[PDB]
Amino acid sequence: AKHPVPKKKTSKARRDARRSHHALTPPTLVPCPECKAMKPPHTVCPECGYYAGRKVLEV
Amino acid sequence: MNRGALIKLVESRYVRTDLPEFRPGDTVRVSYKVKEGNRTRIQDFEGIVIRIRRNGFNTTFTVRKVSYGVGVERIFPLHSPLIQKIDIVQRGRARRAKLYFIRNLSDREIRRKLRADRKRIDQDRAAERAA
Amino acid sequence: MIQPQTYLEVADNTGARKIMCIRVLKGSNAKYATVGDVIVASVKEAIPRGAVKEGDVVKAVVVRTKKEIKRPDGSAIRFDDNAAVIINNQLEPRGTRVFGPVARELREKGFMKIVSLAPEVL
Amino acid sequence: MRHLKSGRKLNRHSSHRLALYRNQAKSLLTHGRITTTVPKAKELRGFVDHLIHLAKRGDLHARRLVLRDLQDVKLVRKLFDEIAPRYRDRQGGYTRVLKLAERRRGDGAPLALVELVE
Amino acid sequence: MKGILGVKVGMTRIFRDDRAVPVTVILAGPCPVVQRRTPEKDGYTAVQLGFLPQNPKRVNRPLKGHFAKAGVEPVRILREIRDFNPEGDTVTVEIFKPGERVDVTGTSKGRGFAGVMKRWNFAGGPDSHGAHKIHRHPGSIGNRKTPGRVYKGKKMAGHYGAERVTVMNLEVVDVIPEENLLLVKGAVPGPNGGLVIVRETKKA
RNA sequence: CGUGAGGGAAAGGUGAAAAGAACCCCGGGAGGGGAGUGAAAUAGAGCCUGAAACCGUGGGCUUACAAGCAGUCACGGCCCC
RNA sequence: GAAUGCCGGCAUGAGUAACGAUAAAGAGGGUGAGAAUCCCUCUCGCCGUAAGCCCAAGGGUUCCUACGCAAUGGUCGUCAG
RNA sequence: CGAUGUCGGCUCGUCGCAUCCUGGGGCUGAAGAAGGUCCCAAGGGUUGGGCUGUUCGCCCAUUAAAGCGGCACGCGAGCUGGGUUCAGAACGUCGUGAGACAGUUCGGUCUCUAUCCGCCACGGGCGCAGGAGGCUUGAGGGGGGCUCUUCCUAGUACGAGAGGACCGGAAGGGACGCACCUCUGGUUUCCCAGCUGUCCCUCCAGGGGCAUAAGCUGGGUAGCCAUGUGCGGAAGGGAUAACCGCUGAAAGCAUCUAAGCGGGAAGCCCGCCCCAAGAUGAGGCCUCCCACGGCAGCCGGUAAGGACCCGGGAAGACCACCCGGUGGAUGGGCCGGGGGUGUAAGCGCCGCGAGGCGUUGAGCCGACCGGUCCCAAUCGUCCGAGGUCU
Numbered sequence A: 001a002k003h004p005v006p007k008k009k010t011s012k013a014r015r016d017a018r019r020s021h022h023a024l025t026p027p028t029l030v031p032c033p034e035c036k037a038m039k040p041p042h043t044v045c046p047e048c049g050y051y052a053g054r055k056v057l058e059v
Numbered sequence B: 001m002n003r004g005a006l007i008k009l010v011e012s013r014y015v016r017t018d019l020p021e022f023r024p025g026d027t028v029r030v031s032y033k034v035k036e037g038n039r040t041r042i043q044d045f046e047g048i049v050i051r052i053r054r055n056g057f058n059t060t061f062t063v064r065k066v067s068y069g070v071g072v073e074r075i076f077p078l079h080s081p082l083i084q085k086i087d088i089v090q091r092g093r094a095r096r097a098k099l100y101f102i103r104n105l106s107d108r109e110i111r112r113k114l115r116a117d118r119k120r121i122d123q124d125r126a127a128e129r130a131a
Numbered sequence C: 001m002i003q004p005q006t007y008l009e010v011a012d013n014t015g016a017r018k019i020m021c022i023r024v025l026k027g028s029n030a031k032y033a034t035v036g037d038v039i040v041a042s043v044k045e046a047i048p049r050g051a052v053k054e055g056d057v058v059k060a061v062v063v064r065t066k067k068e069i070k071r072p073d074g075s076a077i078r079f080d081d082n083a084a085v086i087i088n089n090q091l092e093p094r095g096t097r098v099f100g101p102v103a104r105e106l107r108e109k110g111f112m113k114i115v116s117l118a119p120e121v122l
Numbered sequence D: 001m002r003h004l005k006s007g008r009k010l011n012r013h014s015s016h017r018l019a020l021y022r023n024q025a026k027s028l029l030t031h032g033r034i035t036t037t038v039p040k041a042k043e044l045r046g047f048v049d050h051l052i053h054l055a056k057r058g059d060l061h062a063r064r065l066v067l068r069d070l071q072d073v074k075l076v077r078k079l080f081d082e083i084a085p086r087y088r089d090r091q092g093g094y095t096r097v098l099k100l101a102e103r104r105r106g107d108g109a110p111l112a113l114v115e116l117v118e
Numbered sequence E: 001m002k003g004i005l006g007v008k009v010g011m012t013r014i015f016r017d018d019r020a021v022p023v024t025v026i027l028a029g030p031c032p033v034v035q036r037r038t039p040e041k042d043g044y045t046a047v048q049l050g051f052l053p054q055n056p057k058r059v060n061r062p063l064k065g066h067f068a069k070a071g072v073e074p075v076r077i078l079r080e081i082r083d084f085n086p087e088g089d090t091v092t093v094e095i096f097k098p099g100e101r102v103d104v105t106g107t108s109k110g111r112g113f114a115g116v117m118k119r120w121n122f123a124g125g126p127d128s129h130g131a132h133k134i135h136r137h138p139g140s141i142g143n144r145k146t147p148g149r150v151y152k153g154k155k156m157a158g159h160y161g162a163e164r165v166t167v168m169n170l171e172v173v174d175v176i177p178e179e180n181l182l183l184v185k186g187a188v189p190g191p192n193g194g195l196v197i198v199r200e201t202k203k204a
Numbered sequence F: 001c002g003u004g005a006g007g008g009a010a011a012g013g014u015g016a017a018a019a020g021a022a023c024c025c026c027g028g029g030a031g032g033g034g035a036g037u038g039a040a041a042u043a044g045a046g047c048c049u050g051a052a053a054c055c056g057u058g059g060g061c062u063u064a065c066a067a068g069c070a071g072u073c074a075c076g077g078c079c080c081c
Numbered sequence G: 001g002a003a004u005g006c007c008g009g010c011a012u013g014a015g016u017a018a019c020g021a022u023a024a025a026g027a028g029g030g031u032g033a034g035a036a037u038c039c040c041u042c043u044c045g046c047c048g049u050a051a052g053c054c055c056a057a058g059g060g061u062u063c064c065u066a067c068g069c070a071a072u073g074g075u076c077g078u079c080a081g
Numbered sequence H: 001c002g003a004u005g006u007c008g009g010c011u012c013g014u015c016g017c018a019u020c021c022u023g024g025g026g027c028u029g030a031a032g033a034a035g036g037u038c039c040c041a042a043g044g045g046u047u048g049g050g051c052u053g054u055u056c057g058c059c060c061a062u063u064a065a066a067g068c069g070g071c072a073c074g075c076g077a078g079c080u081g082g083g084u085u086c087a088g089a090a091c092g093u094c095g096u097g098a099g100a101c102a103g104u105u106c107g108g109u110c111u112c113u114a115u116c117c118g119c120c121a122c123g124g125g126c127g128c129a130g131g132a133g134g135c136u137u138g139a140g141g142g143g144g145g146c147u148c149u150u151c152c153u154a155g156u157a158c159g160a161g162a163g164g165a166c167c168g169g170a171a172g173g174g175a176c177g178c179a180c181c182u183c184u185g186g187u188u189u190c191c192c193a194g195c196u197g198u199c200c201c202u203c204c205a206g207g208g209g210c211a212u213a214a215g216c217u218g219g220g221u222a223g224c225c226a227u228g229u230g231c232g233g234a235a236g237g238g239a240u241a242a243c244c245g246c247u248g249a250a251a252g253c254a255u256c257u258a259a260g261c262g263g264g265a266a267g268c269c270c271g272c273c274c275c276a277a278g279a280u281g282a283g284g285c286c287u288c289c290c291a292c293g294g295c296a297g298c299c300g301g302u303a304a305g306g307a308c309c310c311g312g313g314a315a316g317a318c319c320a321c322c323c324g325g326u327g328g329a330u331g332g333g334c335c336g337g338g339g340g341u342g343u344a345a346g347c348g349c350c351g352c353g354a355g356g357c358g359u360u361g362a363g364c365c366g367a368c369c370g371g372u373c374c375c376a377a378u379c380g381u382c383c384g385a386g387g388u389c390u
């Protein structure tokens, strides 16, 4: 190959337009039915250790 | 639906049960329906079974012989309607499922490696004693 | 499954022992010859004082192949060598004897004399 | 293409991956419960269930077969004497995977617990 | 024109007149008529067929109303057969007989991102004689300053398969109505379990 | 930096006075928010003034059928005085 | 306002290439504000005419211990030349 | 000239037509068959090899044919680097010499990262005046488009004879394309077995590591595949080219033409296959929701529905797409079947022994076809109409 190189500096507009897909999506959280704490769905609750209505680990 | 069972169902019209069981290393005679000019006839092909390729209705077996100085292998569908009959000529005892290695052996060396399977020759002779 | 460069044994008594295919005579660009096809070949080995000699450009029909041949009945056949029988432009054998078995495909493809000379037809 | 291909690779060659499963089996059978990554936890289930199921059969052959993977005679002895008996009426499903809430700090890895079932 | 919706079940072969016949087996019917397309209402002629009963729970209200209007149990798949107006209200495998020729449409197996050699049968490059990291590469893709660009439709690497494909003029080898089974000689697009459409052939 | 002869930089400014921010608060710390000092703290030590490129946050007008050396002339819409 | 000018600052390429041998990791326990990365134990793998041990150059405190983590360490760091 | 890399090859095409072949024609010193010459025609096709760096060319074997040109003598940020044209060396030759030739001969560093246009694929956004779930029309694109042999007609027409048809009808091929995995044939990184050396567990027996990122070897399911299998080129309709006419003046005859009508190509339009309503000209049909509060606009809670999350998938780089989420067979396990391997271990018996025989087609056993709630898809959350104007 022969070392491809940018032909022109990217404008502020075009740099920031490329970044129009970069915003994070917030973490999805559901309430824990036992302690009401917010936490990701389908995980053992990290605040009380419950899952599927029973205690799974020490918290 | 059960796809495997529909396929087996389609195949059920064509399965044969009249043919004798055999193993790679057995010596077999295949009486095979053959078309020439202008008639059709039965031609026997006798040789060592070197391969049994199982797949239910679709299993096939390969028989190997020497004909006039030349090795010949024929591949047969086990449920082919063109097979009249299969006759077990001799039971050989192999140590493996695929006997390709005999393609490279002298006649002496083959005889040394596929000796008569006394256990199944006896079992064949115990049966064959019917009412 | 024969192509240019392939060596073939000679299944007759013409004098040739080994021929090398230089052409598959099947259309303008067939890749491979099988049993019952005709080839053009150079004679690469011949016994002394034969009908054909080394260097002769000859024709032959393939009678045996090491690549197995499939048949409509669902079976297949395979030989230990690639073998041909040298012919003239009438598809007639140039020798007088045929050695070893030959594919039954020869019959329908029109080589009745070679089929009847062969000791076995498989 | 991967069409109908079973089994993760976990970026290990063939003998490292096998030694991963064995080592995780010894740890799960030793402590009854381990924390690992979600993908490793999912693969560990079937590997350990089979050794437990052989322990339920109890014969000498099954013990030698299991030793191929576990090696530790005392561990195999615990598997045959204490672990397997509580699964006599349980037909499959000897292990459970549940997913943990917090990812690992240094590399974001999703984690899960694997454990033997009651 | 006649047609039926179906599921590709698998391949085998049968024996017919001492010939092995490769077949693809298709579970075709039965297909309730769900809507008819008329020139007065829709501007063309076709029949919307349904296929495979569905767990009614999984059927939302707009679909439910659709099945109700043409009193028909809930079905997993709706597909139209163009220029077909069957007399009855159920299409079964018996619209074809052994010996007829059919066209079969399936969704081919998905190759995902395919190279130029797999997708387009390009020759690639040499594997020795100095070849440098281009063994599977496409070579040149154009000329020089004229035209200074690459043609639309230039053959390049990319997704290949999981697309609609029709194989034409397949012989119907057998029909088994007791099992809604169709035996079609040869190869049919897509995986076992794939949805297919079987229509009377367009080749005279 | 160079084996060596030899080459050879960058880097100044709180305030009038340290009065250089006790003590409390969040924090592991860094940092900050109060309190307090000062005529002044966007003079708080990464300290006079503090331009420009460059990077943000907020607001007004505008933009997803459009052809562009990016302006200019005209008219109309919206916002502001 | 241009000298591929000089000095300095700051952009673009871009969250891209890369993170330096494909000998390889897993778990449990501990410490701590914080642990894939530190300590401990078990398991696994790699070198073994070395990837182990000793000496001479060269280097110059890098050695041992305690207390630390801003920077240095291609990540992390409670660890460390 | 503050650089526009050079011959030839490979790869990938695309175009022109002054056409090599195939299709259609007129003239012939065209009997037939085969040719010659010109016209129309660019849809497709246009082989493999020996020599040489070669382009070219000659030759071998075929072929329907082995076309010729353009695209920076197309294509080195695509590859090669044999030729030629840096530095070494030699020969012939020239020069007193240092050196020189375009003459010859052997050798001689071809630069990981693509910003923009363009191209191939794939998402996210908004739009398509109410919002939704489906099913669709096809404007417009693309793909494809080759051809031979044999036989029947018929050894007929034609010809002294050799030879040998048109038209019409069969069968079988080559290459190419699309899909497929039943068969044939591969692979199958751990599915099974055998083997060596060494170290280890536990001494025997039985096993484990390592010998490659499988130690080696013999096999091998699913999948992915070609060497394997199916299918395609059309048919047909329409309008034409050259060319041939019918009727027919101007011009009492004649004339395919000036009025008018017909025949007529592998080519053109359509027909076949694939994409396709961002077709902003944003299309159609079926069905579902509804006139909700507060102040063509706004705020909020809902509707039909949708998204998130999770189990996954012959779907896939991601994302998308598709299935399923306890109302459940989605993956994992377990069970059965298939399939592979080919008779485990342990025990008994024969043998001094290596081993052998029996138990035993045993044991092990990925993916394939199914069964089964044993394990896991818990529990949930967030969006989402109130329909502008004539």
Ligand SMILES: CC[C@H]1OC(=O)[C@H](C)C(=O)[C@H](C)[C@@H](O[C@@H]2O[C@H](C)C[C@H](N(C)C)[C@H]2O)[C@](C)(OC)C[C@@H](C)C(=O)[C@H](C)[C@H]2N(CCCCn3cnc(-c4cccnc4)c3)C(=O)O[C@]12C
Pocket (backbone or CB within 6 Å): H003, H005, H109, H110, H111
């Ligand atoms: C391998 C990488 C090199 O590229 C090439 O070598 C490339 C293949 C080229 O030849 C390149 C295209 C040239 O340009 C051409 O110049 C011509 C005279 C004209 C051409 N026209 C078409 C314009 C123009 O394209 C030129 C002059 O490079 C010499 C470019 C010029 C800018 C350079 O000199 C340039 C900086 C080269 N260089 C000196 C290399 C010295 C020798 N070396 C080689 N290999 C090693 C090495 C070192 C270490 C280990 N292994 C190997 C050392 C480097 O260090 O890197 C290079 C880019």
Ligand SMILES: [Mg+2]
Pocket (backbone or CB within 6 Å): A001, E132
């Ligand atoms: Mg390169």
Ligand SMILES: [Mg+2]
Pocket (backbone or CB within 6 Å): A001, A002, H077
């Ligand atoms: Mg390059």
Ligand SMILES: [Mg+2]
Pocket (backbone or CB within 6 Å): A001, A002, A003, A004, H077
């Ligand atoms: Mg490049």
Ligand SMILES: [Mg+2]
Pocket (backbone or CB within 6 Å): A001, E132
């Ligand atoms: Mg390179």
Ligand SMILES: [Mg+2]
Pocket (backbone or CB within 6 Å): A001, A002, A003, A004, H113
């Ligand atoms: Mg580069």
Ligand SMILES: [Mg+2]
Pocket (backbone or CB within 6 Å): A005, A006, A007, A008
């Ligand atoms: Mg540039």
Ligand SMILES: [Mg+2]
Pocket (backbone or CB within 6 Å): A011, A012, G011
């Ligand atoms: Mg900028």
Ligand SMILES: [Mg+2]
Pocket (backbone or CB within 6 Å): A012, A016
């Ligand atoms: Mg900006």
Ligand SMILES: [Mg+2]
Pocket (backbone or CB within 6 Å): A014, A015, A017, A018
């Ligand atoms: Mg951009």
Ligand SMILES: [Mg+2]
Pocket (backbone or CB within 6 Å): A059
């Ligand atoms: Mg707490």
Ligand SMILES: [Mg+2]
Pocket (backbone or CB within 6 Å): B003, B004, B007, E010
């Ligand atoms: Mg099946």
Ligand SMILES: [Mg+2]
Pocket (backbone or CB within 6 Å): B002, B005, B006, B009
């Ligand atoms: Mg059934």
Ligand SMILES: [Mg+2]
Pocket (backbone or CB within 6 Å): B043, C121
């Ligand atoms: Mg015979």
Ligand SMILES: [Mg+2]
Pocket (backbone or CB within 6 Å): B048, B064, B065, B066
């Ligand atoms: Mg024999």
Ligand SMILES: [Mg+2]
Pocket (backbone or CB within 6 Å): B081, B083, B084
């Ligand atoms: Mg019979």
